[PDB]
């Protein structure tokens, strides 16, 4: 039903889950997301998350994409990322290499706020902070990106477009109602073909609102409101997955 997720709806339904943004940043996003959207040719551009830093200048990350194609048996969304320290000005978040991401994986703890820092790894290697941030963001994006099942559909020229005749996910308190965006609409792969204990779902039937929390990445939240038929996801926290998950379950 909805064409794009609404930022105010996301912030309103994820307020309980602890995913919040400051007042100045909220207003600045409201006034600045369209400007960056139209500066590029992106049909869509929305807030992706807010990573916490050490100095106090949190990294606001937004992602956008133009068209959604299906290629090699999957939905390949060509995305572009931007970051900022304040909601006003948006800078590009450059993609990293492969070995640079492997080295990225070895930095732990929250990255500092200054994007001019350099981390030392081991023959020594210098890792810029923006590379680490992009590595973490792409890791989280690859791991968890939820949309309700069959909320999209193929079409002529084989482009994954929204499904304007979406009836609504039946039985939305179960993981069979939600799926990763990369999964093709026709295929039956959903949020239940991954590990058995890395997703939690809460459901309010009277208000008809479902909240899906990722336990592999404890900062990823998603809402699906059935009465309005509106869904949206957010990330708040540092880009670290809890490897010690089993002892937690």
């Amino acid at each position: 039903v909805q064409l794009e997720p609404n930022i105010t709806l996301v912030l309103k339904h994820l307020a309980s889950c602890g995913a919040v943004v400051s007042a100045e940043q909220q207003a600045a996003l409201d006034h600045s997301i369209p400007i960056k959207r139209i500066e590029a040719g992106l049909r869509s551009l929305t807030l992706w998350g807010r990573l916490t830093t050490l100095n106090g200048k949190d990294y606001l990350v937004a992602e956008g994409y133009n068209v959604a194609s299906s290629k090699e048996g999957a939905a390949v969304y060509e995305t572009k990322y931007f970051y900022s320290q304040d909601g006003a000005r948006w800078s590009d978040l450059q993609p990293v290499d492969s070995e640079t991401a492997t080295r990225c994986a070895r930095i732990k703890g929250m990255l500092s706020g200054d994007p001019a820092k350099n981390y030392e790894l081991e023959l020594v290697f210098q890792i810029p902070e923006l590379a680490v941030l992009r590595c973490r963001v792409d890791a989280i994006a690859t791991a968890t990106s939820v949309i309700p099942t069959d909320s999209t559909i193929l079409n002529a020229a084989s482009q994954v477009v929204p499904n304007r005749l979406f009836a609504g996910a039946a039985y939305p308190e179960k993981l069979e109602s939600y799926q990763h965006r990369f999964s093709l609409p026709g295929s039956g792969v959903t949020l239940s073909q991954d590990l058995r204990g890395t997703w939690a779902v809460q459901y309010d039937a009277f208000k008809g609102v479902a909240q899906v929390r990722s336990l592999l990445f404890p900062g990823y939240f998603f809402y699906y409101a059935a009465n309005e038929l509106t869904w949206g996801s957010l990330y708040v926290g540092d880009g670290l997955r809890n490897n010690d998950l089993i002892f937690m379950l």
Binding site: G18, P218, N242, D244, F247, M248
Partner: protein, 39 residues
């Protein structure tokens, strides 16, 4: 205020198997009679 999962950001070390006990010391030995004076 505190909002969030009730976990701590310290490095977790799961408790290894408990230690095994130790048996009695060998101050517990059999005394023996003087043997002989073999020729």
């Amino acid at each position: 205020v505190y909002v969030g999962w009730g976990v701590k950001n310290a490095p977790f070390v799961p408790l290894p198997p408990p230690p095994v006990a130790q048996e009695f010391a060998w101050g517990e030995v059999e005394t023996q009679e003087l043997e002989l004076k073999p020729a």
